[model samples]
Target chain A: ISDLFLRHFDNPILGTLNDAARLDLTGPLAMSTDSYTVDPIFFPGGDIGTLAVHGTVNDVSMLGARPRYLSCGFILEEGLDMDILERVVASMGKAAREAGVFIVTGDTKVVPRGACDKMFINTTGIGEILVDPAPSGDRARPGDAILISGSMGDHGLTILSQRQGLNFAADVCSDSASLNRVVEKLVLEVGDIHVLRDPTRGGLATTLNEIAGQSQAVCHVLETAVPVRESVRNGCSFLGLDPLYLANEGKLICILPEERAEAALAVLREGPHGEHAARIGSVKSVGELGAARAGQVVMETALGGHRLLSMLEGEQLPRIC
Target chain B: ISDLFLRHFDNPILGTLNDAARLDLTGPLAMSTDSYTVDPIFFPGGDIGTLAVHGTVNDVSMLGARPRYLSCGFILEEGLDMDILERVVASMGKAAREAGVFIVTGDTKVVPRGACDKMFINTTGIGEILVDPAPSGDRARPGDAILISGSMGDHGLTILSQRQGLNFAADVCSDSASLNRVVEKLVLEVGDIHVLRDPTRGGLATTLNEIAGQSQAVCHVLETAVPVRESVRNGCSFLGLDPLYLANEGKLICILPEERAEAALAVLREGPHGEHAARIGSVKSVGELGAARAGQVVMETALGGHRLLSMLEGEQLPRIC
Candidate 1:
């Protein structure tokens, strides 16, 4: 049986076990929590650790903030090889450093054998909201242009490929990443961005539907313009999954005014992780969904047909982070 | 085939999907993440929901803070009873309102049939730290008196009784409770308290050992003064578990100056949950653990013999929330 190893660090500031994680009360704080139990913890381009960091950091950035501090907690089942745990934690440290966020506090516990799978991680991140007037999804207006940061379906497709025990000649991996820097650049350039959201779990289609539903506006998307990597699209088609609904770990779908869309898209493309960014859709004033078109999401298909997409259904992929 | 039943709510101040939870950005924040997956999801006195709220609030109060905000993520396995899910969520809402904290944000995901047990909950709480000068575990002094808020071993024994298929004249139920008000009373009454800790995983004896080791002081506890309910004590003895090493959910161990110990104990006893409070021991100038005496914790037995206590080795009862 492995012993409970308590690796105590001697950082004077955080060494004491106190009631709460002390934070300087100077800036606007943004907090978010996400649970990742993705099957096969390690995927092609990214692992659970990096995804955990990026997932929450993106949330903070979407609030027009500078992602600054993070707290990570791991629930590991007993008998997990310590070597593997070390590797995962090291990757998390690297990701935190890269994102310029300090992982200040965390907790670790081991569950009983049958209680859970090998490992599950939950992260709660806190950051400083930088912008004065924060962008909200309710602010999406008529004629707003919808923009997405890079390709869709990569994360979902990669997990599906590994889960189904399928292999292909072309390599495909999850587009897992941290969008804090790119978000900062866009927030500074556009000045009037309507809404920013990370298209995760429910994917771009579900996220856009949420925005359209909330803003009381009808959304129109060009099937050909939506960015999808060739390998990811092929994988999704082979597996009978819609690329629009497939989860994207590190990508986001933003809706901005037609006047500011070009500037925002240009600023996003100049960032390291936003190379394949594109404008895929626009918000419309009139639609047949309803009188107010409120709480309605309509998607225009490639075959000149229109369909309304609802909220996500059960278990798209059991544990895709 | 459970349909995706989402518990939707409206937060006027926070709209749409974003990167972080929109919260009041003032005051000191109390942050804690607790993973609850007890043996039988259903239990007497309380189930996973009650334990979750109490566990998180207790952690926040340990910093002498009142809980204001809480976010819980639920992982429900496919085929779970919807009624049970609703019951759990309702219990959480009731608990939050009782503690004056709002369940502002939440996420629900369904795992595959066998990936996880029926249900698991990860609760992350954020509360404003009220006490500016909070006590920490490392602040124990040589002459400080050790006090306990109430009786020990009830929660652990109660769980053990249910798990081991044992029954008693009095049904042993968990002492799970939100101790913020009680802690607030103590903190407000005795401002000179040196250290405060809740004896959880390793129980009272183990927690004392940790304090002694951290503070580089020897702690002494009298065997007769420690409070344990007769039923719980008998249960531990029958099961070959040490009462001092067993867990207590609704208790706190405080180390304070000898002069302030009486007042602190009085304040705790006046509170609703502190009827069985007592002064168990005191810190020593030097320890008996030889060269390792720098940090040693000792308990004096009823027969006038002194024995050293060690930290808990393995899981006393896995998934005890």
Candidate 2:
């Protein structure tokens, strides 16, 4: 079992078998952790392995930091297939390589077969903050431009298709990718960005709600401006789901000063994963334009009707790894 | 649900709602990770919460570092009792406070019932190293005195009793506690400590075997000198188990130059947790002192007999790390 980690991880620090991986880190660092309990483990576009790495890397990147090291804790079931483990670790290693981060320390515990559903991976990340005055959720102001990288709802809709085996939802690929490179480009070009976030578990609605509440501002989104692929849009309509409430693994929501929004959008459009970048909304003061309350999101429909966007309750779908 | 984490963890960094906790440090750091899947989340000596914090803290402390922050990822079942979660988090908070470390960041994901068995916690720890050249497993050399802090197997036997509902084992309890303070004392008084390790999953036997292999030396343990309480000894005997190979959550084994052994022993004995600290073994070169092989542990019995202790093969008592 020890040999397995040494073989898959293949890092000198982990090979040393010390209790902790010794790292030389200086200055401001960002740390984050998430547990992947996604039921299917394998999903469209990527598996749990890749999701684990990208999820953590994207989190640190969301803080305008450069992810440097990651630590993984895997809880495996005794009856899980060795071949499956091999594939997962292989994908995990490749994902880390692509993200330009090192898997420095990890622990694996194999429990009884019935204790868990196959496996669960918990990844903790550490990264160095690049932007000194890093963009924060509360940094959004009334005049900030709300921008999104790529289309939303792809991951949530894809997981639904894979989990439920829906015919109409077939071939829906999850937008799961590491966002650090995109962030690096944005930070390089637009150092004055105010806020950065990834719309995940609670989807874009809940994420925007939280940011609005944090900044004491209202988020005004334009329905026609938000990017959504036709497949996801149609699948969501048929399933009675809203794309705004659907999760995305490979997208980022950035809030920048209005002047830099165009530069940021141009920078994102240059990337393969973010060619669909669009300015979908803008931050507004609570009393501006008769906005009745603070910390609320209002959507102006393409039909010229207006509706309030409340935070979604619980989860709209099961979840993608 | 999110408010629960904010309340229990109660830290400024977590309250900020950032994806990653921003930390400022300038020096060498140590990072370690572990997932706790122990059954019967509540134990006599400590619950799963305390154990998780202690385990991660000890791993970092073993590297001669002061644990600064911890990140937790909790996987909970939908139907899990809310009361249990509160108890676990409360215990976790108190434990972290006792250890003088902060739970800076966390994630909680609730899966449907039966997808998981109640709850599992994954903790990743980061600490700042105080020792320039931290003691590691491979640093142990021939002629280093092997010292252990307190009795072993109490945790293993206690859990077996709880798991089996036995009468004689009912009084047995675990020795689970944070060890950074112990490490602090050792590093403060005896900075030249060679190897420091906490015998957990595979127990002392496996831990020593690995060190022997890494250091290319043989471990010669005096069976009579190894500290094992009579209750644990008698219980293991009745159950057909070996106390030497049993798991320990609170004890650490340190190897130091023979000349400093007495000083280290006195320092350890001064602590409440290490009253039973004793010198149980010595490191030997491959061909020295009738030792035949590296990466091997040979026990010298009190009956004037010599026995080679091979590493135990399968899960001995189902693992409790």
Candidate 3:
């Protein structure tokens, strides 16, 4: 209510100190939310604050939206250090600005010590949907090319290694980032982009399967073409984990007609975080595998044989943002 | 991600299964967020889920906005019973429907057992600001009448007594309710309202102190005129707490020209939860108390004498949302 929030999130609407922010807003708007409870608040490349803002920014951006405002709701434990809170708030403020969004309205509640972890951050992002009829899971077209924004498994492996205290020779950082810049460009330059999604909680495999199910279609992927950093590959090999199933914080999958695949990839790779953008899969009509096999993800192995990739039954890494 | 959320929130936009919901919206909008981590999850009259939706709805409604949508972000402990989660979700759905709003977007994260309380729900409410040049803290006039929507201290004492396990013959319940109906009525019936706010966390005293500070003006209230339920008054006295310093979930404070007080009061009292609406205070000119005493809340005693009601330095009831 006083200096702490105002000092960090200084804005005309927020500084007004009103119960709710008064905004001039109109839609086609993208509204999204996520709660950040990453086990280690601070990780290799990002902290919980950065993740909280970045993840939701990506969520809204994934729908071809231009993020405008964000609201942060913090549940803080009573004994949480003020310095830690300041650091987190500072990080959140910085991320919101970088993502071109304002922390417009927020609420903070402090529970008795041990009633909660140090803190849990819930972020809700609202943005303008620039895409025609903004993409949804059911927006389907077989032969649509599936593009990945960057290399996979870096975020998961980095967090896993940190918790395991097993630092390897190959360094890795969390791939946490804001996809808004790249997404805005894609929305402006592209057309008929049938699908836009982030490979977050359930990772590349699960996310792809979800879209396939929603579309009642099948996903065909070339395992060798999917970009995975050598470091991530090494880390996953050491841990006996699959890169396709590891959680990602920033990466997204763009689906569009195969004819426009190269065009989308070009614009995607031009972004600061899209250097490793790659086309790894294509959506296939249910006729290819019969309706019984609809929503299946078939991966052509780097060697031979096709492996059916399905959603994981349980979490591989709990509280991994 | 599936029926758990969709089953509870059956809305076209939310069921789209996109990362974000595509909404048809425009500005003058009011947006707000609050995290509900009330202990025991449930209490007399309402539960954490009810507060999660009701409180933010009030925040937006208090700004004279008609809540259109809400986004929920849940941070849940791994061991929390599924039944509890379902119950909470059901309650949230019911409240959102009763408030005439849609739960259009949401996210859920599961942390390991004990990393958090059973569950914490953060609800973000977005609505259109029906009032022209929507009310804010600094929109001031010394002669404005301050109105309380209903009896105070019900929510605070209800949560407190339940936690302390001291039931009295005089029963009380959390006044957790949707203020949208009453607010919409007032907005339609009155004009030039200076401020609209809910007396929640810091109770009436702290909330008034905040507005006074923002307006850089003094507030004068008549203790005899303020509405307080007998049960709440007795409960506060038993705990040696001031009813003025107790939190209220559903009730609101409206500031407007004294000439329009009757209009606002009539609209407020007509609502289901606003039967006890009362003109409890009035904004006083800066000259009355001098600039040195600006932002102070002076309450006249029931018997005589004036008392400076300042902001609470500490919380009376933590997690009492």
* Model 1 misplacement above 4 A: A1-14, A169-171, A288-292, A299-310, A313-315, B1-19, B287-292
Output the better candidate (1/3) by lDDT. 3
**Measured against the native two-chain assembly using Cα atoms, what DockQ does each of the candidate structures obtain, in the order listed?**
0.49, 0.78, 0.77
Candidate 1 on B1-321: residue-level lDDT in tens? 332223432344323345566767565666666777777776667778877777778877777666766666677778888888777766776666677666555566677776678888777777766666776777888789999988887887887778877875375777777777877777776777677778877689888887888888888888888888888878888988887877777778889889998988888887545888899998877634333375677777889988777767765557666
User: Comparing 1 and 2 by TM-score, which wins?
Assistant: 2
TM-score (C-alpha, index-matched) for candidate 2: 0.97
Clashing pairs in 3: A25-B26, A25-B27, A26-B26, A27-B25
Model 3 CA deviation exceeding 4 Å by range = A289-292, B289-292
Q: Supply every candidate's count of residue pairs whose N, Cα or C atoms clash at under 3 angstroms.
A: 1, 0, 4
What is the lDDT for B262 in model 1?
90
lDDT of 3 by residue, B1-321 (tens): 325777777999888768998778766789999998887788888999999999989898878889999988888888778889898889988998898999998887887877887888899999988878667777656889999988888888888888888886455888899989888877777777788888987789999998899898888889988888887888889998888888888888999988899889888888656778889988987778544377888988898987889889775468787
Clashing pairs in 2: none
lDDT digits (tens) for residues A136-199 of candidate 1: 6677888889988888888888888888788653558878888888888777767877888888
Candidate 1 - CAPRI tier?
acceptable
Candidate 2 chain B weakest ten by summed lDDT: B312-321
Better model by DockQ: candidate 1 vs candidate 2: 2
Which pairs clash in the backbone of model 1?
A59-B19
DockQ, candidate 2, comes to 0.78
